[PDB]
Amino acid sequence: MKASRLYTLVLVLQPQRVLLGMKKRGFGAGRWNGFGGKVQEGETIEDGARRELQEESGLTVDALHKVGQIVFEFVGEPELMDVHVFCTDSIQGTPVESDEMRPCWFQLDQIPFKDMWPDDSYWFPLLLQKKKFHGYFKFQGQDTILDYTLREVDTV
Ligand SMILES: Nc1[nH]c(=O)nc2c1ncn2[C@H]1C[C@H](O)[C@@H](COP(=O)(O)OP(=O)(O)OP(=O)(O)O)O1
Ligand code: NA
Ligand code: NA
């Protein structure tokens, strides 16, 4: 059995567009992603997702709704990433570029799948259909899925 670390991922999804963030530096730059990071001690996962959204994008929201959970496993890494996925209820401000991340809106017929994590091609369509899901993806490096599961669920 492995240990898992908790992470969040927030999709700012509006009726016709979605906000994504492009990684500018570090390792993994060039890829568009939702907003999130590691859950911290003592906060609920949802509150951690809100905190990370604000830190990462500048957007503040009072509430999210949970839409999925995805476990990532990487060859050579014993720790699993347990990612809790949320969508925004409403927003009321503008996103901000940081030294690390550039936010950009995409129309929902221009979702930039080829420049997103490969798993997003599988689960983000469910998110657009307002379905809930559980997933698991095993990666070799950043680009190659060796095994995965995806299932629609009634409760995340
Ligand atoms: N395969 C994948 N598909 C996806 O859509 N999002 C992924 C992903 N793999 C990781 N992510 C997301 C999850 C989370 O929002 C983020 C990873 O969090 P980070 O490690 O950057 O967190 P922190 O910024 O809290 O970490 P520190 O560097 O310790 O400050 O990237
Ligand atoms: Na963090
Ligand atoms: Na980060």
UniProtKB/Swiss-Prot annotation:
Binding site residues for O(6)-methyl-dGMP: 8, 23, 33, 117-120
Tissue specificity: Widely expressed with highest expression in thymus, testis, embryo and proliferating blood lymphocytes.
- Please tell me, according to the UniProt entry, what happens when changing residue 83 to M: Decreased localization to mitochondrion
Give residues annotated as binding Mg(2+) 2: 52, 55
Q: What happens after mutating residue 155 to A?
A: Reduces 2-oxo-dATPase and 8-oxo-dGTPase activities and increases thermolability
What is the free-text note on the cofactor?
Answer: Binds 2 Mg(2+) ion per subunit.
Which SUPFAM superfamilies does its entry note? Nudix
UniProt pH dependence: Optimum pH is 7.8-8.2 with 8-oxo-dGTP as substrate, and 8.0-8.5 with 2-oxo-dATP as substrate.
- For binding 2-oxo-dATP, which residues are annotated in this chain's numbering? 8, 33, 35-38, 117-120
Impact when changing residue 156 to A: Slightly reduces 2-oxo-dATPase and 8-oxo-dGTPase activities and increases thermolability
Q: Kindly provide the name given to this protein in its UniProt entry.
A: Oxidized purine nucleoside triphosphate hydrolase
